Amino acid sequence: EKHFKYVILGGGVAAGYAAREFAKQGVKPGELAIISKEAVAPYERPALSKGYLFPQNAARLPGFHVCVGSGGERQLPEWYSEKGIELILSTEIVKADLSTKTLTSAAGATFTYEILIIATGSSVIKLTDFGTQGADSNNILYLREIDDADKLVAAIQAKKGGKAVVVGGGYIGLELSAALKINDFDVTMVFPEPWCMPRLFTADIAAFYEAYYTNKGVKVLKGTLAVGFDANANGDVTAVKLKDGKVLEADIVVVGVGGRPLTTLFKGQVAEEKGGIKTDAFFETSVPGVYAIGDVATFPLKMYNELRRVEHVDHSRKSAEQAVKAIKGKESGESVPEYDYLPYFYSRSFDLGWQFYGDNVGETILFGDSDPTSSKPKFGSYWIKDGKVFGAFLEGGSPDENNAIAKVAKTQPPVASIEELKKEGLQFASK
Numbered sequence: 001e002k003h004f005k006y007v008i009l010g011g012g013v014a015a016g017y018a019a020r021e022f023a024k025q026g027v028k029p030g031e032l033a034i035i036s037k038e039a040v041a042p043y044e045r046p047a048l049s050k051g052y053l054f055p056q057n058a059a060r061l062p063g064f065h066v067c068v069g070s071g072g073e074r075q076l077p078e079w080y081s082e083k084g085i086e087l088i089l090s091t092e093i094v095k096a097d098l099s100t101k102t103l104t105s106a107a108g109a110t111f112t113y114e115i116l117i118i119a120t121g122s123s124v125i126k127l128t129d130f131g132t133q134g135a136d137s138n139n140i141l142y143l144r145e146i147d148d149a150d151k152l153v154a155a156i157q158a159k160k161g162g163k164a165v166v167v168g169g170g171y172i173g174l175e176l177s178a179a180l181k182i183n184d185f186d187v188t189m190v191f192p193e194p195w196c197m198p199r200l201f202t203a204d205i206a207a208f209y210e211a212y213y214t215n216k217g218v219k220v221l222k223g224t225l226a227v228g229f230d231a232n233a234n235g236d237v238t239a240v241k242l243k244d245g246k247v248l249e250a251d252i253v254v255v256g257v258g259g260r261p262l263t264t265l266f267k268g269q270v271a272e273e274k275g276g277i278k279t280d281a282f283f284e285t286s287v288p289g290v291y292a293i294g295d296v297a298t299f300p301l302k303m304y305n306e307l308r309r310v311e312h313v314d315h316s317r318k319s320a321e322q323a324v325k326a327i328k329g330k331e332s333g334e335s336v337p338e339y340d341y342l343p344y345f346y347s348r349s350f351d352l353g354w355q356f357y358g359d360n361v362g363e364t365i366l367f368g369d370s371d372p373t374s375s376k377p378k379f380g381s382y383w384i385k386d387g388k389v390f391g392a393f394l395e396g397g398s399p400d401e402n403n404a405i406a407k408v409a410k411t412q413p414p415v416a417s418i419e420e421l422k423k424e425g426l427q428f429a430s431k
């Protein structure tokens with residue numbers, strides 16, 4: 001049995017950023033441990049569906065370790081060991097007892113703590129949840145962690161020049177379809193929803209991506225459902241069957257149908273809210289000395305006066321800093337300001353790149369040029385509720401223009417006339 005004053009459970013983005021805050025706050029050797037089921041030090045996860053999948057000049061570790069993704073310094077495994085921070089890799093915790101402050105691994109090793117920081121992220125929803133026949137076939141892959149990314153890279157080489165089907169229509173389904181196309185695959189996207197990224201995109205925003213992807217050679221089958229998979233004598237996938245009877249040939253199948261907060265170890269031990277571990281404005285759970293950050297946390301989103309849960313890389317870096325600041329502040333009888341996060345998400349595929357700030361609530365106003373054949377497309381959208389701008393999206397914006405739409409989402413400016421807003425468009429944020 002090993003004991004540490006602070007234990008971080010998980011080794012992803014929030015864990016790496018929490019360790020950086022711990023080092024900045026002064027942490028003595030032997031105080032902090034990080035237990036991860038992955039075999040590598042914390043890395044910037046968004047790179048896994050972007051640069052990691054490039055056919056040439058691909059991003060590889062140690063290059064994209066935290067905190068380079070936000071302009072910070074790189075944390076190789078040596079960064080942890082030189083500071084006396086024990087990085088405990090390839091160790092999966094299968095039991096957590098908050099009353100006895102004990103975590104147990106699959107091989108039976110036990111770890112105790114004084115402060116626990118839950119940073120377990122999300123697990124992928126598999127097609128087994130829907131009872132999809134043949135979902136267990138080989139070459140049917142998911143993409144969450146670097147292990148999956150290495151498997152995907154290897155399968156891309158083995159089946160290069162063949163047919164790929166991506167199941168899912170969110171930003172992951174779009175990013176993986178783009179990745180398979182640039183790796184010389186014949187790619188089809190199947191998703192039951194009427195348009196891609198239906199949780200954020202409107203039909204107007206999605207129409208641009210659908211037409212852009214079609215020009216790139218991708219077949220976007222919206223309003224389509226994969227009901228089964230054919231496999232050969234070897235067990236490898238050979239086809240994806242759809243609800244309508246149509247069959248698509250497939251050498252590889254990549255799935256991106258979402259995830260769920262990885263809160264299993266603590267069910268019944270902590271208060272929950274909307275699928276996440278409920279926390280206050282400092283990320284502390286219903287259990288004193290237990291904190292929850294990143295994807296797992298359902299926290300007060302101060303500017304919206306509601307409890308919210310997000311799958312954002314900015315939130316994962318920021319909530320980690322906030323939780324450590326609160327823990328270290330408490331040691332000196334000090335308090336820290338309440339977490340004031342502005343929702344921010346971004347995606348990348350082909351030569352495109354969009355940014356989203358705020359809340360996608362109310363009615364939307366599309367501005368700019370949404371022609372997918374244009375050499376430099378630049379369009380966006382504003383979300384208006386109660387006569388104020390709540391959300392802002394922009395594809396093809398510059399650093400100045402992205403800061404302008406982030407400024408608009410933060411200040412929630414009044415829209416006196418939507419006729420004037422439709423006249424100014426992006427200039428409304430830029431002025």
Ligand SMILES: Cc1cc2nc3c(=O)[nH]c(=O)nc-3n(C[C@H](O)[C@H](O)[C@H](O)COP(=O)(O)OP(=O)(O)OC[C@H]3O[C@@H](n4cnc5c(N)ncnc54)[C@H](O)[C@@H]3O)c2cc1C
Binds near residue numbers: 344
């Ligand atoms: C492929 C991909 C692309 C993305 N692209 C974007 C993007 O463009 N923009 C954006 O804003 N966000 C993006 N995201 C989301 C963003 O990366 C996440 O929100 C962020 O990584 C979550 O931080 P986290 O610390 O909460 O979780 P994670 O980064 O997932 O870390 C959780 C860690 O806990 C570990 N763990 C879990 N359970 C256990 C256990 N029992 N024992 C030990 N270790 C355990 C996991 O192995 C992992 O290391 C992307 C995510 C993925 C998967």
